[PDB]
Amino acid sequence: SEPEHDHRKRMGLKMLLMMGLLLPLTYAMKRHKWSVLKSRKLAYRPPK
Amino acid sequence: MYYKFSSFTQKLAGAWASEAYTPQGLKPVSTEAPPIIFATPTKLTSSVTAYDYSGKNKVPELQKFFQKADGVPIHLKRGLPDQMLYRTTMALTLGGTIYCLIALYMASQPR
Amino acid sequence: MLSRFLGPRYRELARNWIPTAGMWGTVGAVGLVWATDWRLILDWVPYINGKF
Amino acid sequence: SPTIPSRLYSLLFRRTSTFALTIAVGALFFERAFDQGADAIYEHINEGKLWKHIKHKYEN
Amino acid sequence: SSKWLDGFRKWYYNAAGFNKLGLMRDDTLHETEDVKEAIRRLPEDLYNDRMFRIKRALDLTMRHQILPKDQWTKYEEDKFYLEPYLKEVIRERKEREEWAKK
Amino acid sequence: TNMRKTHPLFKIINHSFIDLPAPSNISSWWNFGSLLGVCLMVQIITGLFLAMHYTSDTMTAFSSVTHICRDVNYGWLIRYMHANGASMFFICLFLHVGRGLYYGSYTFMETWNIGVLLLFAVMATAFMGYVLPWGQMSFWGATVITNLLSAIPYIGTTLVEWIWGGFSVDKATLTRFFAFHFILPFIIAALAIVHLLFLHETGSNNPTGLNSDADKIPFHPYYTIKDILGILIMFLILMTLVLFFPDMLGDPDNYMPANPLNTPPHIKPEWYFLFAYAILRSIPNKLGGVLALILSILILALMPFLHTSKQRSLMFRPITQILYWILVANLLILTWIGGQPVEHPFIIIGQLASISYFSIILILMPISGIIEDKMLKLYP
Ligand code: HEM
Ligand code: HEM
Numbered sequence: 103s104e105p106e107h108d109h110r111k112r113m114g115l116k117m118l119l120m121m122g123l124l125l126p127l128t129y130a131m132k133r134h135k136w137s138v139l140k141s142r143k144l145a146y147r148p149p150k
Numbered sequence: 151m152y153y154k155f156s157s158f159t160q161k162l163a164g165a166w167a168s169e170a171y172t173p174q175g176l177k178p179v180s181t182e183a184p185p186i187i188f189a190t191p192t193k194l195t196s197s198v199t200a201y202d203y204s205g206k207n208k209v210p211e212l213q214k215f216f217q218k219a220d221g222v223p224i225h226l227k228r229g230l231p232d233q234m235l236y237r238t239t240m241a242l243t244l245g246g247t248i249y250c251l252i253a254l255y256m257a258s259q260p261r
Numbered sequence: 262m263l264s265r266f267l268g269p270r271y272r273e274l275a276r277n278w279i280p281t282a283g284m285w286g287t288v289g290a291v292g293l294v295w296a297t298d299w300r301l302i303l304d305w306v307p308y309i310n311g312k313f
Numbered sequence: 314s315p316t317i318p319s320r321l322y323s324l325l326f327r328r329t330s331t332f333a334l335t336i337a338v339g340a341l342f343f344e345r346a347f348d349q350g351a352d353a354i355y356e357h358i359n360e361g362k363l364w365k366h367i368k369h370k371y372e373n
Numbered sequence: 374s375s376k377w378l379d380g381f382r383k384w385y386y387n388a389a390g391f392n393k394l395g396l397m398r399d400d401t402l403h404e405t406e407d408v409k410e411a412i413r414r415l416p417e418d419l420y421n422d423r424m425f426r427i428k429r430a431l432d433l434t435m436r437h438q439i440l441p442k443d444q445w446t447k448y449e450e451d452k453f454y455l456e457p458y459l460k461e462v463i464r465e466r467k468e469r470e471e472w473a474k475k
Numbered sequence: 476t477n478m479r480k481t482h483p484l485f486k487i488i489n490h491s492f493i494d495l496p497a498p499s500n501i502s503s504w505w506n507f508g509s510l511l512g513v514c515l516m517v518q519i520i521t522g523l524f525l526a527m528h529y530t531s532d533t534m535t536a537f538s539s540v541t542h543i544c545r546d547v548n549y550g551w552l553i554r555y556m557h558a559n560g561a562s563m564f565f566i567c568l569f570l571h572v573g574r575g576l577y578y579g580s581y582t583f584m585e586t587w588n589i590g591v592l593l594l595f596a597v598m599a600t601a602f603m604g605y606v607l608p609w610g611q612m613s614f615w616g617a618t619v620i621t622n623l624l625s626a627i628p629y630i631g632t633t634l635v636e637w638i639w640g641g642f643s644v645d646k647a648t649l650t651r652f653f654a655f656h657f658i659l660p661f662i663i664a665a666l667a668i669v670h671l672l673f674l675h676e677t678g679s680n681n682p683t684g685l686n687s688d689a690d691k692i693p694f695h696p697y698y699t700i701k702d703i704l705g706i707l708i709m710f711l712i713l714m715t716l717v718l719f720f721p722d723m724l725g726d727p728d729n730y731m732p733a734n735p736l737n738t739p740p741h742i743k744p745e746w747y748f749l750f751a752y753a754i755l756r757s758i759p760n761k762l763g764g765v766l767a768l769i770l771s772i773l774i775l776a777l778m779p780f781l782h783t784s785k786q787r788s789l790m791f792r793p794i795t796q797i798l799y800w801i802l803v804a805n806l807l808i809l810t811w812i813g814g815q816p817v818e819h820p821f822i823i824i825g826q827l828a829s830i831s832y833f834s835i836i837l838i839l840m841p842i843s844g845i846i847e848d849k850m851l852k853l854y855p
Contacts, residue, residue, distance in 0.1 A: 106551045114718035116351045121711045128707050132700045139499060140436055145188045146425045190441060284330035291337045309345055385850050389791040398851060403787040404686055428689040434682060435500035
């Protein structure tokens, strides 16, 4: 029923290693570009 | 009247009598300096103590080093390496504690 | 009708743009070699001599 | 002698064309190295079960 | 049971959660046409205060933070500044609608 | 002088994806609709690579599917990627709809109506696509759904004969369902363009429900890299689902060839239909069950007229938050009941769940909004 079983599991192992590599890296670029804004400080100067 | 230090060039340029020699306005009094309001002011502190060298009979330089002036406990006072091995110590004991709870629950359940 | 593009300024512009265009051609050549697995090139690179 | 990210920025990561060249070369070498390592791991777990491990008893 | 209702109102005000963002009750109203006309009739100092409060709330929601507990909008100092303008707008709109009925 | 603001092809891309003003505080849930588009694109691509070997005749449908999975190079990857991508597409669609319900996004009425038309289109596309592999449950689910669609008096029998192309599901039904399953995703893509156009006319919604004009950022690079991260995460769940467990969401009985003589002991569709099927089992009337199905999809389109509050989002409405999570809980209950046998105690549980579903959406939520307005000293 599954002649592709061993190949599927090998591709799954490569996928697990590959996504374990690239989730933190893409998260790091997202945190870079969004830590532009996540340290933004806003202030108000009404003339009263 | 003749020269005013301006024009973004760090130099004297030609200016009028009412702009180079009377830079204040002819308003009667100054009006107001309004304050700035904010969410929460951040903390400002400096760090330039660093450390010293190590060797034989170098206890008194470490004695000088462990005088605090920092508001930090002594188990985070050395800086980097004790902090990371503390970090790993509490991490592995938390993992061991939750694995103890999982082990005790699986031991309580029969098969 | 491209006789407008004959001059020293355009020659200097083209001379400045030769190495960037050559590097981009190198990138395109390496990308076409890698994505197609060409046997004329990877058999000369010492590390990649395992799939052939 | 500065740190190696300074070397990577000074020689490779400054120009965009050299950036593309280094990531293409890294793509080639990372492709081959990752394929070889992941395959070796895959027969490390599945040692004695795949066809290439039992092939020598039948192949002539 | 008036104080039971009042304390329940304080509890619901603290449980709604917009006081933790520095917001007033009138900032949280949905900007329909009547509400937009109420903002249009505001004095400029109240308009600037409201716009700064919305900007601060959006900045706090972006970082998934809240204000410190001393900076929360207390129930007693929550001023209902938009109520007379909105009341006038609803009265005028109902007058126009009742004129259009006949 | 720049081609971004001047070139008419690049002008639309600039004003839709690059320089579009977006709220700075929209959470990860706002990823999901963009994910849906990628899912649709992925499905189309995989569908095209399924159309290159699929033969739409009853004697050579299951055999062509086995030829895809066994002889075509990585054809198993394409087919199981298509099936699990359909499942992940409905996951993204359900979360997109639930986010639109929670944060008061139905005030964009035309966007909501184009959305519910898209929902009807993708449900029809999924049903016909499941008919296509010509398994046992494919043929029997098709027969069940069409012969209950025959319940309209004096019109239903002629309509189901004209849908069937005959007396039952046969070769004509399979060919026309292949043609219709091919043609529907392009109409879905055009309706998605109209969906995005109707959204971009009025801007998008922030989780607080306030006016986001005070703080807006360009879409690029912020939500570009956020959507790239969301696409990578969606691909992680999709590749885990296709490469490790290809059959938690499928049915084993579809791996048998279609037998008109043999009926299965249990007939059920996929899970994204199952809750509706539970409502279809809730009322013991044929026409009443069909209208229960149609209103169970259409009251989402009805909900823009059920807003009785002066605050948009549910972030500051905790009673309606509790009632909304009770509604999502009821939807999970109906999804579980829909795949159960028609036997006690599932009948009274399904009837109670359907009654609770229609009561929560129709009755209790506007009353909760009214009393929240009363407690905030707004309602008279
Ligand atoms: C125009 C693009 C599309 C084409 C050409 C296409 C083609 C096909 C084909 C040939 C099959 C049968 C092969 C198989 O067994 O999987 C199929 C199955 C299926 N398709 Fe599509 N499809 C398309 C788009 C979609 C979309 C958008 C959806 C989601 C609503 C979808 C959902 C399904 C489902 C659920 C199946 C059944 C999976 C199975 O039983 O194996 N398809 N499609
Ligand atoms: C065919 C599947 C669908 C696709 C491809 C799709 C696509 C999109 C896209 C690209 C956006 C803009 C990005 C975003 O805001 O997340 C969006 C927003 C929206 N969609 Fe959909 N959508 C789909 C289904 C639906 C459905 C079924 C509804 C109705 C319940 C709906 C209602 C909305 C609303 C109300 C918004 C705007 C909310 C906001 O931007 O804050 N969509 N959709």
